[PDB]
Design a protein around this ligand. Structure first.
Ligand SMILES: [Mg+2]
Ligand SMILES: [Mg+2]
Ligand SMILES: [Mg+2]
Ligand SMILES: [Mg+2]
Ligand SMILES: [Mg+2]
Ligand SMILES: [Mg+2]
Ligand SMILES: [Mg+2]
Ligand SMILES: [Mg+2]
Ligand SMILES: [Mg+2]
Ligand SMILES: [Mg+2]
Ligand SMILES: [Mg+2]
Ligand SMILES: [Mg+2]
Ligand SMILES: [Mg+2]
Ligand SMILES: [Mg+2]
Ligand SMILES: [Mg+2]
Ligand SMILES: [Mg+2]
Ligand SMILES: [Mg+2]
Ligand SMILES: [Mg+2]
Ligand SMILES: [Mg+2]
Ligand SMILES: [Mg+2]
Ligand SMILES: [Mg+2]
Ligand SMILES: [Mg+2]
Ligand SMILES: [Mg+2]
Ligand SMILES: [Mg+2]
Ligand SMILES: [Mg+2]
Ligand SMILES: [Mg+2]
Ligand SMILES: [Mg+2]
Ligand SMILES: [Mg+2]
Ligand SMILES: [Mg+2]
Ligand SMILES: [Mg+2]
Ligand SMILES: [Mg+2]
Ligand SMILES: [Mg+2]
Ligand SMILES: [Mg+2]
Ligand SMILES: [Mg+2]
Ligand SMILES: [Mg+2]
Ligand SMILES: [Mg+2]
Ligand SMILES: [Mg+2]
Ligand SMILES: [Mg+2]
Ligand SMILES: [Mg+2]
Ligand SMILES: [Mg+2]
Ligand SMILES: [Mg+2]
Ligand SMILES: [Mg+2]
Ligand SMILES: [Mg+2]
Ligand SMILES: [Mg+2]
Ligand SMILES: [Mg+2]
Ligand SMILES: [Mg+2]
Ligand SMILES: [Mg+2]
Ligand SMILES: [Mg+2]
Ligand SMILES: [Mg+2]
Ligand SMILES: [Mg+2]
Ligand SMILES: [Mg+2]
Ligand SMILES: [Mg+2]
Ligand SMILES: [Mg+2]
Ligand SMILES: [Mg+2]
Ligand SMILES: [Mg+2]
Ligand SMILES: [Mg+2]
Ligand SMILES: [Mg+2]
Ligand SMILES: [Mg+2]
Ligand SMILES: [Mg+2]
Ligand SMILES: [Mg+2]
Ligand SMILES: [Mg+2]
Ligand SMILES: [Mg+2]
Ligand SMILES: [Mg+2]
Ligand SMILES: [Mg+2]
Ligand SMILES: [Mg+2]
Ligand SMILES: [Mg+2]
Ligand SMILES: [Mg+2]
Ligand SMILES: [Mg+2]
Ligand SMILES: [Mg+2]
Ligand SMILES: [Mg+2]
Ligand SMILES: [Mg+2]
Ligand SMILES: [Mg+2]
Ligand SMILES: [Mg+2]
Ligand SMILES: [Mg+2]
Ligand SMILES: [Mg+2]
Ligand SMILES: [Mg+2]
Ligand SMILES: [Mg+2]
Ligand SMILES: [Mg+2]
Ligand SMILES: [Mg+2]
Ligand SMILES: [Mg+2]
Ligand SMILES: [Mg+2]
Ligand SMILES: [Mg+2]
Ligand SMILES: [Mg+2]
Ligand SMILES: [Mg+2]
Ligand SMILES: [Mg+2]
Ligand SMILES: [Mg+2]
Ligand SMILES: [Mg+2]
Ligand SMILES: [Mg+2]
Ligand SMILES: [Mg+2]
Ligand SMILES: [Mg+2]
Ligand SMILES: [Mg+2]
Ligand SMILES: [Mg+2]
Ligand SMILES: [Mg+2]
Ligand SMILES: [Mg+2]
Ligand SMILES: [Mg+2]
Ligand SMILES: [Mg+2]
Ligand SMILES: [Mg+2]
Ligand SMILES: [Mg+2]
Ligand SMILES: [Mg+2]
Ligand SMILES: [Mg+2]
Ligand SMILES: [Mg+2]
Ligand SMILES: [Mg+2]
Ligand SMILES: [Mg+2]
Ligand SMILES: [Mg+2]
Ligand SMILES: [Mg+2]
Ligand SMILES: [Mg+2]
Ligand SMILES: [Mg+2]
Ligand SMILES: [Mg+2]
Ligand SMILES: [Mg+2]
Ligand SMILES: [Mg+2]
Ligand SMILES: [Mg+2]
Ligand SMILES: [Mg+2]
Ligand SMILES: [Mg+2]
Ligand SMILES: [Mg+2]
Ligand SMILES: [Mg+2]
Ligand SMILES: [Mg+2]
Ligand SMILES: [Mg+2]
Ligand SMILES: [Mg+2]
Ligand SMILES: [Mg+2]
Ligand SMILES: [Mg+2]
Ligand SMILES: [Mg+2]
Ligand SMILES: [Mg+2]
Ligand SMILES: [Mg+2]
Ligand SMILES: [Mg+2]
Ligand SMILES: [Mg+2]
Ligand SMILES: [Mg+2]
Ligand SMILES: [Mg+2]
Ligand SMILES: [Mg+2]
Ligand SMILES: [Mg+2]
Ligand SMILES: [Mg+2]
Ligand SMILES: [Mg+2]
Ligand SMILES: [Mg+2]
Lengths: 386, 52, 131
RNA sequence: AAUAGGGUGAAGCCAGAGGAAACUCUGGUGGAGGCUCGUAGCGGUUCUGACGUGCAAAUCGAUCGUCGAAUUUGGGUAUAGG
RNA sequence: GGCCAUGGAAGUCGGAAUCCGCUAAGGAGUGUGUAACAACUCACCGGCCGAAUGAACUAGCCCUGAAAAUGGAUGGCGCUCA
RNA sequence: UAACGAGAUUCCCACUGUCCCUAUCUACUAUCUAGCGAAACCACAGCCAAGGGAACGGGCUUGGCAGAAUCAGCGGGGAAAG
RNA sequence: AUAACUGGCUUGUGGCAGUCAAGCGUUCAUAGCGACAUUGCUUUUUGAUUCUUCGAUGUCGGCUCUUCCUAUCAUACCGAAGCAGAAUUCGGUAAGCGUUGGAUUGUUCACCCACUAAUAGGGAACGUGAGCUGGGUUUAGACCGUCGUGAGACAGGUUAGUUUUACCCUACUGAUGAAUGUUAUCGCAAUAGUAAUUGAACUUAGUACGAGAGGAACCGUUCAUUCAGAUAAUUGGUUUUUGCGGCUGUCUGAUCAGGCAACGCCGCGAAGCUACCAUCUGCUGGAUUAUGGCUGAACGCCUCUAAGUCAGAAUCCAUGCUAGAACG
């Protein structure tokens, strides 16, 4: 017999299996499609989730009841110090898919990126890339030959870049190394750009502009093993049910004499790889700017950091990106920021954002001050100040 | 945008922070956090709350 | 005649609110909410500015035992406005109206949510303080 | 042989008041009852709770009926398979 | 402008009639188009051309008729002058 | 039919997480370890679909397929056990 | 060797659909219907039978959850009308997507109130009891009515009546892992899965249409329903932070400072977790179905079709998204 009433299914079948990600660094499954006519430019950047804040902004949305009126919106801070270019990979179009042809590396690698290739760095002789560094001996013709091979045969050129994680407050010393696809220009142009950028820093302001829409690749928060009630949002069984109520009562019909793959079952929740799209860039801040949190209406000399620092992260002393809303991951997670895969002309995508004010009260409690000067002005002299 | 002031303690209210209570007599009350709001719903005297 | 943003629902089916107009009713018992879709076991629920089908549980005898439209004008469940402000009233109140949103009373006691006044010009006309 | 602590306030009795009388009223005192709230006790309503290869071949937890009598109970004794 | 109905319908609204004359040729009308006519077009007759043509029926294969629940069975693959 | 009722039934006030619609916390389990160490059950065993068949196959036929050793949960099946 | 669930054959009966076309439809058989007859399909009815199970397959209903069918209630695109508009009716491709909240009833069924785009019908051992519940039915106690001399009966009514076990195998959900020289980093992508859905308001516009009454639609704009995936700014919830303060009883001769009350109680309470009780995000190309066409024979005309060809659906395949074959 049929179900008494027709209700929608619990959960999405397009995010199965709900298993842990193979790596903690989210990987870009698909890059923006290459257009030769554009200039040579990067399509992605690596950052670290610092924390969330609040802004005030005047809305430009004709026909809305909040048009030209202040709205209060949640925002996410991504600490993004400039990345260092250390390598380049060539991809070839084959009848079996993309296949990596060659990887060319830079002469000098910093210690933070050479720690990426080790599980026990302190016990090692640190021999990685020493003979390869010797490959540059007084003519470096091996490197030029491989680069010419890439120019001759590669159809997709990607750069290898790593974060400068020593500039962040994280205690982790391993850098995060990723492939970032190069778009724009011919294959020769991409290869020349990659070679000429070896051992150089690339900033966020060269990849993302303000008011842009970008996508976020990250691994979500882990919750461990979870029951069906919270893992899948199933209905709780009555209070008086024997042997418990946080279950799915019927896990299958008599036939097929098996449990179906579509039935909600208890298991591991969170720590999934996710791609979240259409997050607007409200601010690309600079670490050298002493008015990160200042706007054109709030001229308080103020960094983006709240009072007492970001909870469980620290201070953002680098360039940063202020994104609208929420992005996947937890604090300190490595986050991949990717350019959008399509052209959005909606009023939400083309609106020019001008910020009024950014909240910098403490996130560690009911903070009520934006600045220590404001605090001591409100409370006056204390006993500890003498 | 405007900085608001707590009705019970004088604490500075920034956009979004705290709750806003409209009594039956349409008097508008502003609370910067749940702490002062909870005291007010207990009909405490802010004049006698030692930190307001 | 209006497009108000989503608000936290305050009055599920079975809730009894105050009747804030001088029509002679004192209670308004919610039995349905206009615009409620389908979801198994989920109760229809109304926010301020929502049209409701209601009966008068307490009031003049000629107002009792009938289904009539009403509009919620204030709610005690806090809800967030697009300016970030969380606000709530001291009580939940409504007024009896037509299917067109026209009041059967002629005055409103107490404040009215700006969400409700922005959506029903009839209730705005008869309203005093609007928050 | 055993049965915390409270509530209610029956007869009888004392004083005063009204009435022509027959009588009535008020304030106390008194401490009745297979009365009542409720321990121990005796019982075992509900969770159709726990457990349900148990601590246990009937228990455990909360909740509950009654709790000064047709009360509870030890021992001795009598009644024995149509 | 055949008639009667019908304001009128004159072929083209419903009824009648179902005629005659000439015509190789014309329905007292095929339709468009009209308030009706006009107007255009078909039955209809001819002028042109260079051998087929029209109607009804019969039965072979194929198609329609042909809608059920796990995914699935000419045994499977697959097969189209097989 | 007053009073009484762990009796059956309907409604109202208060209360409420019974529910909208779920969330959070504590102890003991579960979990891992040292030591100790049973029982039910057992033709052989253990992936599916269709066919046919004692008309609902783990085994047969035809297909899909198929790669050691494993852990915590789970309650579709073993037409599970009793 | 034989009756009460499911299952199997049948399909009278139940349900659904055809054929001819006497009639209905102001005229007019077939826009929409359609008698007398006649051909079928289905197994959600009930019969008929008794093949399997009586060294037992837990027999109603509801709750929960997944999936499938289409004879489509709504949503997409269209053809038809006795389609002027609006509305409505018939039909095609269509199961991608949705199909509700309640009063009474154990109910399935039913019937009302109400919202809604719609409140379609069904299957999977009449799905689903080592998932629950146990109101009904169907043990034993008891009451009533009728029947019986009686013990008792009732397919009549009523009340109270134990719902057991998973640690095995498989399967599902997740989690490790030997060996394919070792170890590390970055990758490719076969295959499998897949995601969005519907409504309202403004403008178009009191316009087209219409005597009037009435009254659309495309582009665009702002919101909302159901769903999905995240997130913890803010607000709310939670407190063994037993963090701070308060309170009672008792104990330490008093104070200070503490112990206990099977976390003693109360107010606040960060962090963490978490809520349509909070916020953010949910993409764009091709090929097609129905259908409407172009050229064009067959058949000197005609014809969307035969060869060839254009546009085109909530469909399909990609883009994108999830896993990464532990013998790629
Ligand atoms: Mg069912
Ligand atoms: Mg790709
Ligand atoms: Mg090589
Ligand atoms: Mg090579
Ligand atoms: Mg945890
Ligand atoms: Mg944790
Ligand atoms: Mg949980
Ligand atoms: Mg139970
Ligand atoms: Mg157990
Ligand atoms: Mg915080
Ligand atoms: Mg709070
Ligand atoms: Mg329900
Ligand atoms: Mg006297
Ligand atoms: Mg006296
Ligand atoms: Mg006494
Ligand atoms: Mg007492
Ligand atoms: Mg006894
Ligand atoms: Mg007991
Ligand atoms: Mg029990
Ligand atoms: Mg047990
Ligand atoms: Mg027992
Ligand atoms: Mg008691
Ligand atoms: Mg007691
Ligand atoms: Mg007793
Ligand atoms: Mg008693
Ligand atoms: Mg005997
Ligand atoms: Mg004998
Ligand atoms: Mg004998
Ligand atoms: Mg005998
Ligand atoms: Mg067939
Ligand atoms: Mg089939
Ligand atoms: Mg075949
Ligand atoms: Mg065949
Ligand atoms: Mg053969
Ligand atoms: Mg009772
Ligand atoms: Mg009772
Ligand atoms: Mg009765
Ligand atoms: Mg266990
Ligand atoms: Mg051990
Ligand atoms: Mg043994
Ligand atoms: Mg079949
Ligand atoms: Mg077969
Ligand atoms: Mg079979
Ligand atoms: Mg068979
Ligand atoms: Mg069968
Ligand atoms: Mg099988
Ligand atoms: Mg078997
Ligand atoms: Mg085989
Ligand atoms: Mg194994
Ligand atoms: Mg089983
Ligand atoms: Mg077993
Ligand atoms: Mg059965
Ligand atoms: Mg069957
Ligand atoms: Mg039949
Ligand atoms: Mg049949
Ligand atoms: Mg029949
Ligand atoms: Mg018929
Ligand atoms: Mg026909
Ligand atoms: Mg049958
Ligand atoms: Mg039927
Ligand atoms: Mg038999
Ligand atoms: Mg049988
Ligand atoms: Mg049997
Ligand atoms: Mg049995
Ligand atoms: Mg059995
Ligand atoms: Mg048997
Ligand atoms: Mg049986
Ligand atoms: Mg069974
Ligand atoms: Mg029910
Ligand atoms: Mg169909
Ligand atoms: Mg249709
Ligand atoms: Mg007609
Ligand atoms: Mg479906
Ligand atoms: Mg299908
Ligand atoms: Mg789609
Ligand atoms: Mg509804
Ligand atoms: Mg219903
Ligand atoms: Mg109900
Ligand atoms: Mg009810
Ligand atoms: Mg009900
Ligand atoms: Mg009921
Ligand atoms: Mg119905
Ligand atoms: Mg059946
Ligand atoms: Mg059944
Ligand atoms: Mg059971
Ligand atoms: Mg059942
Ligand atoms: Mg079962
Ligand atoms: Mg019963
Ligand atoms: Mg049963
Ligand atoms: Mg009985
Ligand atoms: Mg009889
Ligand atoms: Mg008699
Ligand atoms: Mg008798
Ligand atoms: Mg009998
Ligand atoms: Mg009976
Ligand atoms: Mg009964
Ligand atoms: Mg179990
Ligand atoms: Mg168990
Ligand atoms: Mg076992
Ligand atoms: Mg076994
Ligand atoms: Mg497996
Ligand atoms: Mg497994
Ligand atoms: Mg897995
Ligand atoms: Mg859409
Ligand atoms: Mg208008
Ligand atoms: Mg008008
Ligand atoms: Mg007009
Ligand atoms: Mg006009
Ligand atoms: Mg006009
Ligand atoms: Mg007209
Ligand atoms: Mg009008
Ligand atoms: Mg439109
Ligand atoms: Mg969620
Ligand atoms: Mg506390
Ligand atoms: Mg206190
Ligand atoms: Mg004290
Ligand atoms: Mg002590
Ligand atoms: Mg203590
Ligand atoms: Mg004690
Ligand atoms: Mg609190
Ligand atoms: Mg909090
Ligand atoms: Mg913490
Ligand atoms: Mg959601
Ligand atoms: Mg949205
Ligand atoms: Mg997407
Ligand atoms: Mg196209
Ligand atoms: Mg075509
Ligand atoms: Mg063709
Ligand atoms: Mg991989
Ligand atoms: Mg692999
Ligand atoms: Mg091999
Ligand atoms: Mg091999």
């Amino acid at each position: 017999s049929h179900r008494k009433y027709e209700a929608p299914r619990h959960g999405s079948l397009g995010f199965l299996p709900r298993k842990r990600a193979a790596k903690q660094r989210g990987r870009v499954k698909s890059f923006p499609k290459d257009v030769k006519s554009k200039p040579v430019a990067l399509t992605a950047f690596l950052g670290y989730k610092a924390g969330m804040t609040t802004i005030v902004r005047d809305l430009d949305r004709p026909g809305s009841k909040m048009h030209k009126r202040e709205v209060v919106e949640a925002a996410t801070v991504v600490d993004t110090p400039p990345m260092v270019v250390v390598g380049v990979v060539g991809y070839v179009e084959t009848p079996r898919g993309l296949r990596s042809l060659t990887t060319v590396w830079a002469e000098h690698l910093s210690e933070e990126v050479r720690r990426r290739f080790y599980k026990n760095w302190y016990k090692s002789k640190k021999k990685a890339f020493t003979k390869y560094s010797g490959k540059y001996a007084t003519d470096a013709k091996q490197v030029e030959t491989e680069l010419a091979r890439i120019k001759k045969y590669a159809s997709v050129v990607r750069v290898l870049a790593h974060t400068q994680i020593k500039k962040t407050p994280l205690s982790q010393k391993k850098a995060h190394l990723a492939e970032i696809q190069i778009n724009g220009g011919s294959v020769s142009d991409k290869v020349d750009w990659a070679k000429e950028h070896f051992e150089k820093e690339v900033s966020v302001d060269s990849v993302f502009e303000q008011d842009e829409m970008i996508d976020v690749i990250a691994v979500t928060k882990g919750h461990g093993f979870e029951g069906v009630t919270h893992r899948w949002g199933t209905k709780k069984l009555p209070r008086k049910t024997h042997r418990g109520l946080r279950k799915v009562a019927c896990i299958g019909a008599w036939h097929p004499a098996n449990v179906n793959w579509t039935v909600a079952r208890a298991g591991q929740n969170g720590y999934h790889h996710r791609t979240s799209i259409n997050h607007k860039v409200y601010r690309v801040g600079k670490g050298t700017d002493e008015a990160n949190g200042a706007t054109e209406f709030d001229r308080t000399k103020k960094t983006i950091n709240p009072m007492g620092g970001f909870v469980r992260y620290g201070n953002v002393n680098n360039d940063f990106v202020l994104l609208k809303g929420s992005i996947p991951g937890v604090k300190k997670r490595v986050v991949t920021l990717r350019k959008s895969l399509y052209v959005d002309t909606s009023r939400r995508a083309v609106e020019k954002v001008n910020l009024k004010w950014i909240d910098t009260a403490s996130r560690f409690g009911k903070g009520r001050f934006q600045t220590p000067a404001e605090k001591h002005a409100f409370m006056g002299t204390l006993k500890k100040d003498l | 945008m405007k900085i608001e002031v707590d009705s019970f303690s004088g604490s500075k209210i920034y956009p979004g922070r705290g709750t806003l209570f409209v009594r039956g007599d349409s008097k508008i009350f502003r609370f910067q956090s749940s702490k002062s709001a909870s005291l007010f719903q207990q009909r405490k005297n802010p004049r006698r709350i030692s930190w307001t | 005649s209006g497009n108000k943003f989503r608000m936290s629902l305050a009055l599920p089916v079975g809730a009894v609110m105050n009747c804030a107009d001088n029509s002679g009713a004192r209670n308004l018992y919610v039995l349905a909410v206009k615009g409620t879709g389908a979801r198994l076991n989920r109760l229809p629920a109304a926010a301020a500015g929502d049209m409701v089908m209601a009966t008068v549980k307490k009031g003049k005898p000629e107002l009792r035992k009938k289904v009539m439209p009403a509009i919620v004008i204030r709610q005690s469940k806090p809800w967030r406005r697009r300016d970030g402000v969380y606000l709530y009233f001291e009580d939940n109140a409504g007024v009896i109206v037509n299917p067109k949103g026209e009041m059967k009373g002629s005055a409103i006691t107490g404040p009215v949510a700006k969400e409700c006044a922005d959506l029903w010009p009839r209730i705005a006309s008869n309203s005093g303080v609007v928050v």
